[PDB]
Amino acid sequence: PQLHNGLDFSAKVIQGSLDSLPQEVRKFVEGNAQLCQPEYIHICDGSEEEYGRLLAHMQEEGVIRKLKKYDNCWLALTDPRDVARIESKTVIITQEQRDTVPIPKSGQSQLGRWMSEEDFEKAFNARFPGCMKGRTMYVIPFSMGPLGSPLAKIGIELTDSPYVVASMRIMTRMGTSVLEALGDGEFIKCLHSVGCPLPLKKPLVNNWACNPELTLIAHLPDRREIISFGSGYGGNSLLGKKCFALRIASRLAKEEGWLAEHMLILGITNPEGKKKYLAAAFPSACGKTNLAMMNPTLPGWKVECVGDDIAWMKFDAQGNLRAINPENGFFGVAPGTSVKTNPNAIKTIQKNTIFTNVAETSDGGVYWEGIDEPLAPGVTITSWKNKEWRPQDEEPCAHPNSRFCTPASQCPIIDPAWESPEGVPIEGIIFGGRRPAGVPLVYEALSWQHGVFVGAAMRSEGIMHDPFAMRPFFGYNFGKYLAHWLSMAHRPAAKLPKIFHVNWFRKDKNGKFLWPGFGENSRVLEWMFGRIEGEDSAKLTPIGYVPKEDALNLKGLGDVNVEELFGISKEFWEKEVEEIDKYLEDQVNADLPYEIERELRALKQRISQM
Ligand SMILES: Nc1nc2c(ncn2[C@@H]2O[C@H](COP(=O)(O)OP(=O)(O)OP(=O)(O)O)[C@@H](O)[C@H]2O)c(=O)[nH]1
Ligand SMILES: O=C([O-])C(=O)[O-]
Ligand SMILES: [Mn+2]
Ligand SMILES: [Mn+2]
Ligand SMILES: [Mn+2]
Ligand code: NA
């Protein structure tokens, strides 16, 4: 199948065999090898020997350091240009812009970024030819979801980054068993390169290959492709997570009738042994991982984690909304993680964990802002920028969105059903974000449609809208996403979860948090649980149902200002409704569903009667 010798890449395979790949996986690999010109092709097996050897290789090259205080833990320090997702370089390609994002009445969209097929083709041609010269192309066969689950979906990621291979081993199920499960089926095609072919054209910084100027994270849902160039970091390189399991998957979910969401999934057991599963969407920086792994303060309750970040949810034959965690690990923010804020994460991350952009202590441990624990005298700190550091210093010792990357099966409170292939039955959906003023600790939506409106009104901070926690992640037009959520009410026999909204972040007149939060949030979960069971524990208000006086267990919290935390001001809510109206008109306009407009007016009307 060639007149010469450059099409068949068999001679460059250094692990596995192209002949044993399913036919369409071989075509994907070989086509991209022809394009990218890697030196070597390594078909990953997912084995512990492969992983160990690749960590040791990175360690020898200076790409990662072993953290000698802990068991098989590692630290990567990046080029400070690479350190986060970059929305302006994250795009979705469709034939028509409006299918990807609504057309905003002014400015640019806050709800996604479209690129034309033409522009993408030019961008691709300016980046990928030859991009892997001198490097190994690793072929990562991975499952998003428990292997073999009816709700799981398989991808193949090609990458030139060992860091990505190691991290994908933690964050997804990868290796030979996935190829076996895939057989001749369909898969999402994921192509990644750090964009630094050898010999290097530009200086390597911190032993971290990246190409910031050309960084581009593209999604082609009608080709079932994700193509990412130039960043080695996080959501830009681990293509299963945000690119596949939110942006691609949300588009698929819309077409097929299910939901792909930026939600934790937790199981909560009351003192009588009754257990329910809840899903919660909070924006980045608003505490999903804390809640998902909560150590409850209320005696007799238990919380167990199914996932901390992404949920795929589909109604079953009996009308239960079943959720799976499509991830295999937790890719959690390190700063702010302490024994007080997340004791179960602290336990989790002491073995088999990769840390990125945190500080290292002189005894080979980790450190970060908010770790809230002192070091022995004499123990010194190296910042994430590889410089000596002391607490008085002007800049943080860890990057603010530095991360740990840890196996889920580790977590001491991992839920027993976290890999059940049928998924767990969701009985409540929680929305929430950071509202320093106005918004009570917890309220319950009046209806499904009201709950969709409440999702649409979420904020990641007082100022910033982040509907459904999906602002950076919508795979398609957010108006159409709202219509898709609203359509669930018309699915016969659907057991629609109860919808709540929480606010951990209300502040008093002095800027102090009114609610202590963290494991105390168990008290709010208890109220939700009773509400799902039909307890008469709610009082009707203009915004939804709130707890009755005395309904929340506040034992141990007598210093809480209840009236203030729980207060609803006409003045605040008049302004809230006007702000929501202006935001939806500006950002959604012609794509805003009937029923969302109707919920906005209904809320305005109820507030007018206060
Ligand atoms: N006051 C208060 N802060 C909280 C609570 N739970 C979490 N936080 C804060 O939430 C932040 C940590 O949340 P993140 O790990 O960034 O949130 P996430 O939702 O997991 O974000 P991604 O992993 O980026 O999706 C820190 O600032 C915490 O102090 C709470 O109950 N009360
Ligand atoms: O990495 C994440 O979870 C994020 O950015 O939301
Ligand atoms: Mn070398
Ligand atoms: Mn998180
Ligand atoms: Mn997230
Ligand atoms: Na480095």
Residues 6 or more apart in contact with residue 319 via CB below 8 angstroms: 491, 492, 493, 494, 495
Q: Are 508 and 552 found together in one domain?
A: yes
- Its sign, for the CA torsion 147, 153, 154, 155, is negative
Residue 371 is which amino acid? I
Q: What is the DSSP letter of 472?
A: T
Distance from residue 138's CA to the centre of ligand 3 (Å): 16
Distances (CA, A) of 500 to 323, 419, 431: 18, 26, 6
C-alpha 163 – ligand 3 centre gap (Å): 14
Distance of alpha carbon 387 from alpha carbon 369, whole angstroms = 16
- 4 found inside a domain: no
What b-and-e string marks burial along 533-566, b requiring 16 or more CB atoms within 10 Å of the CB?
eeeebbeebbbbbbbeeebbeeeeeeebebeebb
482 shares a domain with 353: no
Q: 200-219 burial, b for 16+ CB within 10 Å, e for fewer?
A: eeeeeebebbbbbebbbbbb
Rounded-to-integer distance, Cα 288 and Cα 102, Å: 28
Domain enclosing residue 92, as ranges: 9-62+86-257
Asked if residue 48 and residue 191 are part of one domain, the reply reads yes
Distance CA 185, CA 188 (A): 10
Question: Could you tell me which of 508, 506, 547 has the C-alpha nearest to residue 525?
Answer: 547
Sorted by sequence, the CB contacts under 8 Å of residue 189 that are 6+ apart come out as: 28, 155, 156, 223, 224, 225, 226
Residue that finishes a domain, picked among 359, 386, 412: 412
585 known member of a binding site: no
Residues 489 and 576 in one domain: yes
Ligand 1 surroundings by CB, under 6 angstroms = 282, 284-290, 309, 332-333, 336, 341, 504-505, 513, 517-518, 521
Q: Are 523 and 516 in contact (CB under 8 A)?
A: no
User: Ligand 1 atom 23: the closest Cα is on which residue?
Assistant: 332
For the Cβ of 235 lying below 6 angstroms from any atom of ligand 2, the answer is: yes
Structure-determination approach: X-ray
Dihedral angle computed from the Cα positions of residues 450, 424, 329 and 249, in that order, rounded to the nearest 10 degrees: -60
590 and 505 together in one domain: yes
438 is in an annotated binding site: no
Residue listed under structure tokens 């034992």: 555
Kind of pairing, strands 188-193 and 225-229?
parallel
Would residue 251 count as lying in a domain? yes
Q: What is the CATH number of the domain that holds 30?
A: 3.40.449.10
The single residue listed with the structure tokens 């909304």 is 321
Out of 412, 443, 470, pick the residue that ends a domain.
412
Atom 3 (ligand 2): residue with closest C-alpha? Answer: 309
Q: In the 8-state DSSP scheme, what is residue 352?
A: S
Resolution attained, angstroms: 1.2
Q: Read off the CATH number of the domain in which 590 is found.
A: 3.90.228.20
Q: How far apart are the first and last CA of the chain?
A: 77
| Ligand 2 binding pocket includes 215 (Cβ within 6 Å) | no
Alpha helices in 153-230 (DSSP H): 162-171, 176-182
Domain-located, residue 569: yes
The CA 212 to ligand 2 mean position distance, Å, reads 20
User: Hey, which residues are catalytic here?
Assistant: 286
3-state helix/strand/coil string of 445-480: CCCHHHHHHHHHCCEEECCEECHHHCCCCCCCCHHH
> Which ligand 2 atom is the nearest neighbour of the CA of 284?
6
Q: Which amino acid is at 463?
A: I
Closest protein CA for atom 5 of ligand 2: 284
The verdict on 263 and 363 lying in the same domain is: no
Looking at the structure of the chain, the number of domains it has is 3
Cβ atoms within 10 Å of 459's Cβ, excluding its own: 23
Token pair for 262: 């930026």
State the Cα–Cα distance between residues 302 and 268, nearest whole angstrom.
Answer: 6
Distance (Å, rounded) from C-alpha 411 to C-alpha 334? 16
Q: Retrieve residue 522's tokens.
A: 């168990």
163 belongs to a structural domain: yes
The verdict on residue 280 lying in a domain is: yes
Q: Nearest C-alpha to atom 32 of ligand 1 is from which residue?
A: 517
574 and 558 in a single domain? The answer is yes
Length reported for the chain: 610
Give the chain's count of helices (H) and strands (E): 16, 32
| Residue 40 CA, ligand 5 centroid: distance in Å | 33
